[PDB]
């Protein structure tokens, strides 16, 4: 007395095909953009490309697999396992790519001087290839023996008339829910997501601390100038100049144009320090006044450029954090439903329509990343226009 299953099946299959088309087109555009623009050919975008390659595979393979397993067709149980678990391989690869992007950005903001020598393209390719191997091993673990193939639903397999060694290919009949909850969700998805949260929190903490240190050195420069102009004793000028020389060397610790600026600044401070040690107070004050011209024509240019670079790193890290957040938004509902199915056997199973709504939502994650790049990364957006208009 239920509606014919092909009616709801047609809606589900049509929606899945719409998602596969959008996932392929958008992520092919991302890969094409990185190929054409050398400004997008950095190590960070090598993981973005691996991220896009997995989403392309979601539309090409994982979504046709999901359509197949929804029919419950008779199949050899290990072949049904591969059909059911291959999306876990792709998803695990994206988790590894997302974690590497956060680590790459944390390295770029914590030690930017050592970044290009530490994070190279060759090492990135090796990391990516290793993570794909681990993704296959993690996602296909049920094929190694952790499955319900040894406990088949004989009622379903007889009613559908499956042959010997065959089962009705249904996800929750062949894939153990304890694998899905403890192994896949808790260990392989939830824990890495929490690690990404901690890395991005450390990224924003590092940026906030460095931006405050730039303003601290800047105000230390201007406040000690007022101390010298209103000083009366020679030691007052000397103590204020010693603290400027520390804040000057600690601020540097066309790139030589900024190095030449601190050379003038420290040189003038040493000039005023020599006069202050001699007892000359008026001549030491006038020498310290020369620091203002160096501050305007040099030191202020470094502050605003160093501040601009840090603000770009904050904005870029926020964009990459949105991608992690949308990943969790798309996949957590399916994981949470499996937790209810596993941990509350007295709860009624989530209805059929909610199951496939959660499945469809997890697939839409393969569509959203190209939109994040187009809206939040100007280099991607301008390359997208160039590809499309020509
Ligand atoms: C034509 O079709 C012929 C077939 O014949 C079937 C006969 O009718 C079945 C409907 O129920 C009848 C009443 N019986 C009852 O017992 C009543 O209560 C219910 C209700 C609904 C259900 N669900 C119905 C929907 N299924 C969808 C199968 N599926 N596909 C992919 C994934 C998945 N499931 C889970 N968990 N994940 N997790 C992940 C994942 C990845 C990363 C993290 O998580 N990916 C999946 C699940 C079970 C169960 C019991
Ligand atoms: C390079 C790409 C495009 C190749 C695609 C490979 C896919 C389409 C192939 C490889 C292994 C194949 C599975 C191997 C096991 C059999 C078991 C059988 O009872 C039903 C079909 C099933 C489940 C096959 C489904 C399709 C399958 C998953
Ligand atoms: C992570 C963000 C998007 C929030 C996730 C909300 C979803 C995953 C939660 C909120 C309410 C939850 C439902 C509340 C009612 C129960 C009834 C029980 O018999 C089956 C599970 C079911 C149906 C839960 C399924 C998962 C659920 C729908
Ligand atoms: C990403 C953050 C939010 C952590 C992930 C949320 C998960 C771990 C939490 C949120 C809601 C929790 C569920 C809330 C309802 C209870 C019902 C109980 O009978 C079994 C445990 C169960 C089903 C919990 C299982 C674990 C659970 C699904
Ligand atoms: C089975 C599911 C869980 C398994 C998880 C525990 C496995 C233990 C450690 C494995 C080492 C990593 C193996 C992957 C490396 C593949 C080789 C490769 O390609 O490495 C190229 C590298 O750039 C230069 O060799
Ligand atoms: C059809 C294949 C059969 C199955 C496909 C599996 C996933 C595809 C794996 C592709 C991995 C892409 C990795 C990548 O592109 O990283 C290079 C990076 O750009 C450095 O230059
Ligand atoms: C690249 C395209 C991918 C297609 C998904 C693979 C689809 C898997 C096809 C399974 C069909 C099958 O085996 O059906 C047997 C049925 O039980 C007897 O009528
Ligand atoms: C919503 C779509 C319902 C599709 C119903 C499937 C039967 C189609 C065959 C027919 O149109 O005669
Ligand atoms: C985000 C986009 C969400 C798309 C929502 C559109 C409808 C989604 C799923 C339809 C639910 C009906 C599926 C019927 C069960 C499949 C079956 O009968 O085997
Ligand atoms: C989009 C292409 C049309 C998809 C319709 C699926 C119907 C196939 C079926 O379930 O019988
Ligand atoms: C099947 C996948 C076909 C698309 C793969 C090639 C696109 C990547 C690219 O444009 O550089
Ligand atoms: C199905 C297989 C999906 C293929 C996915 C991506 C193709 C390989 C990666 C695309 C080109 C990467 C090189 C580059 O962008 O610089
Ligand atoms: C670029 C290629 C992308 C994939 C092309 C193939 C498109 C076909 C999509 C899914 C087909 C699913 C077949 C359904 C299996 C039905 C099982 C049964 O007969 O009982
Ligand atoms: C290009 C692909 C176009 C549409 C393919 C739709 C295939 C229909 C799947 C039917 C599943 C079933 O056997 O019930
Ligand atoms: C690229 C090559 C990838 C495809 C390789 C071959 C897939 C064919 C395996 C299907 C086995 C069917 C099992 C059975 O007959 O019951
Ligand atoms: C490229 C990687 C291609 C797929 C790896 C093959 C996974 C098959 C595992 C063996 C399970 C089995 O044969 O029963
Ligand atoms: C192009 C990729 C080349 C590698 C292809 C290797 C085989 C992939 C399909 C076989 C894995 C599915 C295992 C299920 C089974 O064999 O019974
Ligand atoms: C198989 C060996 C794994 C260790 C090498 C891989 C490097 C770390 C990989 C991910 C672990 C989680 C990292 C958590 C934050 C690390 C960033 C940091 O502390 O600087
Ligand atoms: C530049 C780097 C490009 C990386 C391409 C991706 C390579 C992925 C290769 C296939 C790994 C499959 C082998 C895993 C075996 C264990 C899975 C299993 O059979 O259980
Ligand atoms: C994140 C990591 C969370 C790890 C698991 C905490 C709860 C473990 C479940 C206890 C077993 C309950 C039971 O099934 O009897
Ligand atoms: C990476 C390592 C993270 C592992 C995370 C926790 C896994 C969940 C542990 C729960 C134990 C379940 C035991 C039980 O079933 O009673
Ligand atoms: C693993 C991290 C769990 C999430 C809590 C964030 C940790 C931030 C680290 C820090 O601020 O020092
Ligand atoms: C549990 C949730 C988070 C724990 C608190 C994270 C630490 C806050 C930032 C620490 C700091 O300011 O150094
Ligand atoms: C888990 C929480 C999911 C939150 C992710 C939402 C991203 C918001 C970014 C934005 O669009 O402004
Ligand atoms: C669950 C962990 C998700 C970590 C990142 C999501 C929140 C950050 C954000 O919305 O930008
Ligand atoms: C779009 C929002 C979709 C549904 C969100 C809440 C789902 C709760 C389902 C309750 C039905 C039930 O358990 O019987
Ligand atoms: C609906 C699936 C995706 C959920 C959030 C949509 C984000 C769209 C966007 O940020 O451009
Ligand atoms: C079915 C696919 C559902 C939507 C996924 C795409 C999310 C972003 C699309 C809206 C953004 C925009 O208005 O340009």
Residue numbers in the entry: -2 to 208, 1001 to 1042, 1057 to 1106, 219 to 305
Which statements did the authors publish about this structure?
The G protein‐coupled adenosine A2A receptor (A2AAR) is an important new (potential) drug target in immuno‐oncology, and for neurodegenerative diseases. It couples to Gs proteins leading to an increase in intracellular cyclic adenosine monophosphate (cAMP) concentrations. In an effort to strongly reduce the number of point mutations and, in particular, to avoid mutations located in the orthosteric ligand binding pocket, we developed a new, significantly improved thermostabilized A2AAR mutant harboring only a single point mutation (designated A2A‐PSB1‐bRIL) and yet endowed with superior stability compared to the A2A‐StaR2 mutant. In the novel mutant, the larger lysine in this position displaces the sodium ion together with three structural water molecules, and fully occupies the former allosteric binding pocket without disrupting the overall helix geometry of the A2AAR.
In fact, the highest A2AAR affinity was achieved with the shortest PEG linker comprised of four ethyleneglycol units (compound 4, PSB‐2113, K i 2.28 nM). Despite the sterically more demanding tricyclic core, the Preladenant derivative PSB‐2113 binds to the A2AAR in the same orientation as ZM241385 and shows similar direct ligand interactions to helices V, VI, VII and extracellular loop (ECL) 2. In addition, the tricyclic aromatic system is stabilized by π–π stacking to F168ECL2 and by hydrophobic contacts to L2496.51 and I2747.39. PSB‐2113 is connected to helices I, II, III, and VII via water‐mediated hydrogen bonds, similarly as observed for ZM241385. However, the tricyclic core of PSB‐2113 extends further towards helix II which leads to the displacement of one of the structural water molecules from the ligand binding pocket. Hence, the displacement of the water molecule by PSB‐2113 from the ligand binding pocket would be expected to be energetically favorable and is likely one of the reasons for the compound's high affinity. The phenylpiperazinylethyl moiety that is attached to the N7 in PSB‐2113 extends towards the extracellular surface of the A2AAR, stabilized by π–π stacking to H264ECL3. No unambiguous electron density evidence could be observed for the PEG linker that clearly sticks out of the binding pocket. This indicates that the PEG‐chain located at the receptor surface is highly flexible, which is a desired characteristic for the intended purpose to attach variable reporter molecules to the terminus of the linker.
